[PDB]
Amino acid sequence: HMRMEFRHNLPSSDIIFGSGTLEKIGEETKKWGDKAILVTGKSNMKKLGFLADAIDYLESAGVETVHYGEIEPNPTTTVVDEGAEIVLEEGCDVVVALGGGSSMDAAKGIAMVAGHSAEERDISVWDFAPEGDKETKPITEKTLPVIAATSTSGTGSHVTPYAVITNPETKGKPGFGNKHSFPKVSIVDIDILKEMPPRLTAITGYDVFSHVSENLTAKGDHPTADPLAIRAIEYVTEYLLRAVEDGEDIKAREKMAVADTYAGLSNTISGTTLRHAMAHPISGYYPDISHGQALASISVPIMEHNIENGDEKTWERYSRIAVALDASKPVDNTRQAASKAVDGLKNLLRSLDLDKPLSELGVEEEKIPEMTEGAFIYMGGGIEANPVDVSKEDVKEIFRKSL
Amino acid sequence: HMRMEFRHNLPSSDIIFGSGTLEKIGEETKKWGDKAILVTGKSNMKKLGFLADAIDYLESAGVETVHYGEIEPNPTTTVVDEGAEIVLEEGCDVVVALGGGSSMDAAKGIAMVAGHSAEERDISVWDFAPEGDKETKPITEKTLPVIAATSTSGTGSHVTPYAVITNPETKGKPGFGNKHSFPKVSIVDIDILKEMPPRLTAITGYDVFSHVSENLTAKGDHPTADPLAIRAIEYVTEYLLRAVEDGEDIKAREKMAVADTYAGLSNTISGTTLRHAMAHPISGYYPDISHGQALASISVPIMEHNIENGDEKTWERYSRIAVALDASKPVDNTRQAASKAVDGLKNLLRSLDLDKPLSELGVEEEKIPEMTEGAFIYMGGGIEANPVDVSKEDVKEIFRKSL
Ligand SMILES: NC(=O)C1=CN([C@@H]2O[C@H](COP(=O)(O)OP(=O)(O)OC[C@H]3O[C@@H](n4cnc5c(N)ncnc54)[C@H](OP(=O)(O)O)[C@@H]3O)[C@@H](O)[C@H]2O)C=CC1
Ligand SMILES: NC(=O)C1=CN([C@@H]2O[C@H](COP(=O)(O)OP(=O)(O)OC[C@H]3O[C@@H](n4cnc5c(N)ncnc54)[C@H](OP(=O)(O)O)[C@@H]3O)[C@@H](O)[C@H]2O)C=CC1
Ligand SMILES: [Mn+2]
Ligand SMILES: [Mn+2]
Fold first, then answer.
1. Dihedral class, residue B296 (left if φ above 0, else alpha if ψ from -120 to 50, else beta)
2. Which positions in this protein are listed as binding Mn(2+) (chains A, B) (predicted)?
3. Architecture of domain B1-197
């Protein structure tokens, strides 16, 4: 018998779940600071009115608030470092996020830079970012406390330590963070999530599936995440399409919000693999490409590569994924039973209209070697966690099959 | 549609899982203190040799160690308060537990008393213990850090904030604790667990099932614990009997150790209900009665009472339990489908030889009103979490049916 060995690490988590829980953003933030910077996108939270509510709740609680509504999708080092300057100039002592993964990651990055800086600064978020064997700057408890109110059922960033920041100079899009950047309080408000338009619901919904399906097949044992990851796939297949077709289907929104929370906890305990490692340089070199669409456009080839070079333990995991996708009935540990996850995958991608080759997104074949370099330089952890080896030419071939 | 509302709270968790992970008890304890008190039972850890190993690893790591091997099953206030005096007399700054729930709870209690005490003491663990509407003493970060190495696949105490301490004067056996008493590091060593004799494997195995089955049916929504609780029941039904019949079945031991870890995390997020609330005064008034056997001897009547006074949401949960116990195939939300959990329960109790009336344990009918008073005084939280009301006469009747 092969013995089981693993180490489970999950930072303290405090999740407020329900509709209208934005109410609490003020009371909770006060416990951590008296003056907050409110990190958000540029239009939607404002247009929908939740920006005004959050500011009200914060002020009403007694938290003086500086609004930083500059976060564009796929946040950049410049937008994080410039928000940190505002934290240092205004003396903010707590970072509050209201938005999607782009807002919550920019918030964590701002908390890192501002907490480790001198008076005027002297450090950039990129110092914390992996890059080859570059000795990163340690992320310590100096990191400012973070309050995260997610507006999308996609990234699970409200319950992960990670921030994914793009460097426009290098085009790298690495993730980084630890227990000191895990949000102190996480707010999931169904009234905010239900306003996701259909396309946004589909994109972010598939990010949930991408996290848990990679967490399950990551190398090694990780049994504390597996039940959460499995349950998330079951919720995706049962409720994601319901949420896209009817944004006001509250039960479907609640299930995706729980599934997205599962993915955050699961992704903290375990980790993503080749699919995420290759989707990052896509959004890094093509910033107008959504993270979820990049994941979808390369999933089929990647899952086929891991299955063809896999073993019975990995095949058993892909088989459970297929069952959770309603693509099969019995779990088995063969190459054939694992292949049914590819059929269930294609079905999920089709029902969501996410099955597009990279060509239809704007990616060009000339960019392959650069994106491959980007995957290994900035996502080495994901490549290592993948259940099967991949050389630099394996990844180049995968990219071209996805064109 | 009924909206979903819940708050998830889980303290930071650090779990080292494998065989021979007692190796790490020294390195990990050093990160938290230089002089530890080693809290253990009186004979088994010593007889099996793991006491000598732990002391070695601790010394070898540079942690001077004072051994307190006085913990008897169902720890008492006196044994916790006397261990705290040794912590204060010797100047220990970290509490290390090597044993079952009785050792790990006594360790948490020692950490509480010693951390909040003056020079000589002036406070007892009972000050922290619930007792009617008695204003308990707040448990704060003053609590000494705790390192927990479990020796049994039963209580999940290595990943819970709780300590269950008996007061011999009152006979109460309440549980108490919070984030400040959650072990900093948790070590699960298969080489220690596999030495559990058959009866101990059966008793502690059923405590795992008792936690998760009550966590699932606790009142309100708690979806972050449910997948872990379900997966634990599946592991119990598939592997617990294998572990009892062959203590050296390593895969069965690993599954019960994971299932026991599931139960700890689940019991932290959710909570136990009537079964635990009534099993405590049993061990409180009859200290030689094992916690797990007390749970088993009252389960059938309690589960029948909750099912008869339940609703469709509660019935659906008991139905999922029945499916996980191999007692049924389809999940449904009816009284009939829920009743199949009782059949699967009786099957589990029979295969483990735990189906004994309270009479065969030594309980006497004259003790009913006292045990009922004990349930409400010291386990009010569990009664409140139960999915259906229970009056004081409901609990008296339940006790007599279990005789
Ligand atoms: N663990 C982690 O840290 C993870 C991080 N990520 C990263 O996090 C980011 C996630 O991006 P994602 O969160 O998917 O979407 P983004 O947050 O990047 O942007 C979402 C877009 O949809 C709009 N929007 C957001 N919420 C709503 C709503 N409730 N109703 C209407 N419109 C809305 C926003 O408007 P506005 O412009 O006003 O915001 C924005 O234009 C990506 O960069 C991804 O790489 C991905 C997975 C995990
Ligand atoms: N979350 C919590 O805090 C929970 C707490 N509990 C409480 O925790 C306690 C749990 O008691 P439990 O842990 O079930 O058993 P105990 O730890 O109370 O005692 C176990 C008995 O078995 C022996 N033993 C323990 N491990 C081994 C082994 N590996 N090989 C051989 N013999 C062994 C011990 O010997 P020695 O005498 O040498 O130790 C002792 O006699 C109970 O008091 C229960 O009420 C229950 C559920 C949850
Ligand atoms: Mn993602
Ligand atoms: Mn118990």
1. alpha
2. 207, 211, 276, 291
3. 3-Layer(aba) Sandwich (3.40)
